[PDB]
Write a protein that binds this ligand. Structure first.
Ligand SMILES: N[C@@H](Cn1cc([N+](=O)[O-])c(=O)[nH]c1=O)C(=O)O
Lengths: 48, 48
């Protein structure tokens, strides 16, 4: 929707982007050039 | 114990090396230049 990868807002604590459409249930699997980071490995699972 | 990395025998179905000393309960964690492969992930978990 918002055309973004994914990072957490510092204020609203709201995850946006691809990651956001996962943790909020709006999608099941994410296939895109998403970068494996720490804060992301905490909220979602990553393949190799 | 055998100085090997970790591969499975095709005849006897045994795991040698560090993968083996993990799957057979000899060690708790394998910190070494151990290549992440499809067959190795199938018996022991790998970190990123
Ligand atoms: N690390 C690899 C084993 N391994 C090691 C070396 N090495 O010693 O640099 C190599 O050249 N090639 C190889 O397959 C593995 O874990 O399978």
């Amino acid at each position: 929707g918002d055309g973004k990868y994914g990072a957490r807002d510092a204020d609203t604590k709201i995850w946006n982007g691809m990651v956001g459409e996962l943790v909020y249930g709006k999608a099941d699997i994410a296939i895109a050039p998403l970068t494996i980071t720490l804060v992301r490995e905490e909220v979602i699972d990553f393949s190799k």
